[PDB]
Design a protein around this nucleic acid. Structure first.
Lengths: 216, 213
RNA sequence: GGCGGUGUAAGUGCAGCCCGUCUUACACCGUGCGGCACAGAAACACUGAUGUCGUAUACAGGGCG
């Protein structure tokens, strides 16, 4: 019944500005506290900001005070986080969250948005090159090389191949660009009958590639 | 600013174990403490509210307790779907503060990696760089060591590794290692070897290829 | 309720007696303010009850055997 859909993430340079949105349904945001919570990659949860019902009182983490503004539009049932003067350390997945109803779940945050990624960096967007990892049960894969920023998505055979797939976390190269591999293991006999195509999408650069992986 | 000191920062437990996670508040937070469970790449999910009340739909094997400023999350018997990172949170005073997290992984029998090696593609060799890739598939425990040799010469500083999260269906890990070389260096040398040390192997295993096989 | 005002009575600075002041009781009249609990879709603010525990001028001495 309750949904929270976030948008507005992406890449900006240091000192830049973004506005995140959290569009709610199933409840009126006016009668709940709404919070923003962020998570830097590989790190823990960090509370960012909140707005109270009835008063409209707002509260901020020390690191963001003066730079971020949380707000709510009652007519659109949408909450917002205006982020100005962004820094590298603000890079994180940002979540909106509903603080629940007092008599039902105390002060626990019972519903969460899906998260939106914010990257603060001077490096330029670049789409990846995709190279096959030719079949060696057999292992095969794709190398997704030299892209910025995160993330890429990889599927196999347009989602029909999921078992045995391992898409590894990206590593940052010394060049400042990311690289990952996605592998899958299959029965060797299937190499003769099933075509294996890795589907790579790099939405931040609008690069989308399908690479057939064949025996060498 | 109220601190929430959470311990331990990680733990590995077997299916069926009772696990206890502790969060200490730097000062009184009354009972305004919540606990969350977070799976990789997902939003956190509320488990416990007001220190000790179970949120609707959460299994009875989860419970919370308060003694003064010490708060405890208990899983009475650990199930395989309980691997995650767990967080405490205080909502007594602004700014709100989360504990640092307890990553819970599932114990499992030792399993040696299955090792595969991939030469660079002809397409990449048109470009001036060569990437050689070594895959270590479905091993446990997580710790593993990869050394690269080019014509028996040990490589250093020209490789990077990345590890998956623990698999939900067999509780293993996989690891990929990528060796970066110039196109010219790759086309000159013949024998490319990945050497893997892991507790499931009594001595290191080598997988290799010869350029042009 | 607590506090204050006024009135009536009794007791009360002495070796003793008297007046006052002081205290207590009763009567009527004015009159609150906090802190902490609770609820309202509710951490603050806002609205509404009811409890509790607390609070507020440090002006008294004189007369006669």
């Amino acid at each position: 019944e309750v949904q929270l859909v976030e948008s507005g993430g992406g890449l900006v340079q240091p000192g830049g500005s973004l506005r995140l949105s959290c569009a709610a349904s199933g409840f009126y945001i006016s009668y709940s506290s709404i919070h923003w919570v962020r998570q830097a990659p590989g790190k823990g949860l960090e509370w960012v900001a909140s707005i109270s019902p009835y008063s409209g009182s707002t509260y901020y983490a020390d690191s963001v005070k003066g730079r971020f503004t949380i707000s709510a539009d009652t007519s659109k049932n949408t909450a917002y986080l205006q982020m100005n003067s962004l820094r590298a350390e603000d890079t994180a997945v940002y979540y909106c969250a509903r603080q629940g109803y007092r008599r039902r779940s105390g002060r626990g945050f019972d519903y969460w948005g899906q998260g939106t990624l914010v990257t603060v960096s001077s490096a330029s967007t670049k789409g990846p090159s995709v190279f096959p990892l030719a079949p060696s049960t057999a292992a095969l894969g794709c190398l997704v090389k030299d892209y910025f920023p995160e993330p890429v998505t990889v599927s196999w055979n347009s989602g029909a191949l999921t078992s045995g797939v391992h898409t590894f976390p990206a590593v940052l190269q010394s060049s400042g660009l990311y690289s990952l591999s996605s592998v899958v293991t299959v029965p060797s006999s299937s190499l003769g009958t099933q075509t294996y195509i890795c589907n790579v999408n790099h939405k931040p650069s609008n690069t989308k590639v399908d690479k057939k992986v064949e025996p060498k | 600013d109220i601190q929430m000191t959470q311990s331990p920062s990680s733990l590995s437990a077997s299916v069926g174990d009772r696990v206890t996670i502790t969060c200490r508040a730097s000062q009184s937070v009354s009972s305004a403490v919540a606990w969350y469970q977070q799976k990789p790449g997902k939003a956190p999910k509320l488990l416990i509210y007001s220190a000790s009340s179970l949120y609707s739909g959460v299994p009875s094997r989860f419970s919370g307790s308060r003694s003064g400023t010490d708060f405890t999350l208990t899983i009475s018997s650990l199930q395989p779907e309980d691997f995650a990172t767990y967080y405490c949170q205080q909502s007594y005073s602004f700014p709100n503060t989360f504990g640092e997290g307890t990553k819970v992984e599932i114990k499992r029998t030792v399993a040696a990696p299955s090792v595969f090696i991939f030469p660079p593609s002809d397409e990449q060799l048109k470009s001036g760089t060569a990437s050689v890739v070594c895959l270590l598939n479905n091993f446990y425990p997580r710790e593993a060591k990869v050394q690269w040799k080019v014509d028996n010469a040990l490589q250093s500083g020209n490789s990077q590794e990345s590890v998956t999260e623990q698999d939900s269906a067999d509780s293993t890990y996989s690891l990929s290692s990528t060796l970066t070389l110039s196109k010219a260096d790759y086309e000159k040398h013949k024998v490319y070897a990945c050497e893997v040390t892991h507790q499931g192997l009594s001595s290191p295993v080598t997988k290799s290829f010869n350029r042009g096989e």
